Amino acid sequence: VHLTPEEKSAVTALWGKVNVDEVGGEALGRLLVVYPWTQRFFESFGDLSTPDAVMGNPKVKAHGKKVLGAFSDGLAHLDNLKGTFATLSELHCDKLHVDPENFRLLGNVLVCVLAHHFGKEFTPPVQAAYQKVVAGVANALAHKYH
Amino acid sequence: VHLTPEEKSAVTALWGKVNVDEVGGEALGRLLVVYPWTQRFFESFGDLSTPDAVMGNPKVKAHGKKVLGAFSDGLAHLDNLKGTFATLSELHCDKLHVDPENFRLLGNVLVCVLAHHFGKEFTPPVQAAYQKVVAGVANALAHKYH
Amino acid sequence: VLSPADKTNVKAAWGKVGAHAGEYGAEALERMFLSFPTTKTYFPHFDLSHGSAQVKGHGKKVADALTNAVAHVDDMPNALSALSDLHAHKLRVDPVNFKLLSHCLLVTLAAHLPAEFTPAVHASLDKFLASVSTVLTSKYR
Amino acid sequence: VLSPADKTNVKAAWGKVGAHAGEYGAEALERMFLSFPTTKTYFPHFDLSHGSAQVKGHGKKVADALTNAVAHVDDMPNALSALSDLHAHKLRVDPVNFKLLSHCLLVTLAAHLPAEFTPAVHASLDKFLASVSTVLTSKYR
């Protein structure tokens, strides 16, 4: 975004250690649990009645992997998140009707998951850089809303 | 900001009718009355104990005129707000220590003031243009924070 | 919390709304759709065209609910329970959107009640809409 | 509204914090200052440098108050009356900032209580910090 080369390196390097599969399933599940109203878009997923039911739902897990996948690919275009997510921005608006506020919530959940995972390694300065990223991605995804 | 030409004309047309002296005092006074926490910056202004004490305070009125004066200038450089507001942004941060959320509250108050003053003339679409404008200014004013 | 003063202010300004509540409700929606386009994501099933009967119909419903909250200013949590349930469990509108509608409701009132929209009334009305918003979002989690 | 499970969850989690609460208080502030630099506007009189005794000391103060709140999870409004006063009438921190510190505290807990930071506990702590926030900003106007 407006990431410092140093801030760019910190992001880049932590990410290389990330199991997208697991982090993605966990970020999305935590979202559905912490902010239950987000479940409004996943009725067709099934049983989201309990934390256990959400965290275990394979439809949730697989959606999480798809979302983090796309997120992952965006870290390669940190200089043009806007052009990288344009089509995804239109889809979310025009087809999915997802309020962009949701992008923000996930971002924050994502940050909690990384801290959870990396403990020590997820230092204040590393968090600062990730916060800039999540904000940047949320902004890019909301960009084509009208 | 993303102002269509027809949004820019609508902003400009209306602004032509505004008495910056008067709207300035009204907007600042109302801010201090609706969000009393904002009074934290004006303890040297004296009595702000009641709505009448605020609205009629010669210091609030004078300050209001100064703020809206700076804002009107911003309206002639809608193309380069960040540029226009840079030294003011630096000052608000480094000297005044004003949380930028204050800039968004003032923006909202200003929109109500314009609605109050223009009645029916402040149409849904004119409000939409002004919403873009106050957000752009708030953003410009917060750009130099660090 | 609403003070006695706030309560008088709200009953007074809402009193003036009278029979226009419906139209004002519809207008607040339109302003919200134009200024905060993201709010449109909750009405994919609506014709959001200018003078849509759906918007008109919806504006009345919202206005009727606010009128009901004013009528029960000392028991809002109970007067609005049903609506609180609906929003929490079915509609699931993100909380931030309430602040957007509130703001557009304030704009509409300002635009229509120049004489009553005093600083003091403005303050009371803001606190009021914040309280209604808090109630409607109280059962979210 | 904290459920019985929530209160339990919170008391468990905080239970584990123990002797480190002060350190976690300090670390959450540091995380806030770095991630949301606008929050620094309320601490112009502090040395915001890493490991500053002012930040350390303040972290302790915040942690202790959180502790006291967990202890009076049932009577928060009353246990934190003085703090609600201080913030409403003296400090006057804009309410948006409470969400930023809350988030940084969650992050801090996550990073240090891996086993204990389950999805359900995460949910409870969030609601808890929200409730604490609500109490601290309840007398603002």
Ligand code: HEM
């Ligand atoms: C990091 C931010 C996000 C990214 C990069 C992202 C990306 C994606 C991608 C790549 C798809 C695949 C669909 C397709 O290509 O047809 C998708 C679908 C979808 N996303 Fe997003 N998403 C994000 C956030 C969210 C959030 C926060 C929600 C709601 C809480 C959401 C709701 C959905 C839904 C409902 C679908 C459709 C899934 C289906 O067809 O079953 N997304 N998203």
Ligand code: HEM
């Ligand atoms: C549209 C947004 C604003 C603009 C364009 C603006 C502009 C100005 C200007 C031109 C000055 C005088 C600069 C100087 O002393 O050299 C000033 C001072 C000041 N502004 Fe801002 N301002 C804005 C919003 C705010 C808000 C919302 C607050 C607080 C809630 C605020 C707090 C102050 C304070 C405390 C001073 C110094 C007053 C004194 O003691 O002389 N400003 N502003």
Ligand code: HEM
């Ligand atoms: C204080 C503010 C609000 C009030 C008083 C209010 C009140 C109502 C009422 C009375 C209804 C109709 C329920 C029925 O059919 O009996 C309703 C439905 C609805 N509201 Fe809320 N609401 C508020 C805020 C919001 C916000 C901010 C949004 C989203 C931006 C929203 C989205 C909806 C939707 C999507 C429906 C269903 C409409 C339909 O399909 O007919 N509401 N609301």
Ligand code: HEM
């Ligand atoms: C989790 C919610 C919070 C709690 C429990 C909390 C608690 C406290 C406590 C215990 C004190 C010290 C009171 C004393 O000195 O006796 C304090 C002071 C203070 N707080 Fe709050 N606080 C919270 C949120 C915030 C936020 C979000 C900000 C601003 C971003 C803030 C700004 C301040 C400031 C500036 C002081 C005075 C510092 C000094 O001058 O020493 N607080 N707070």
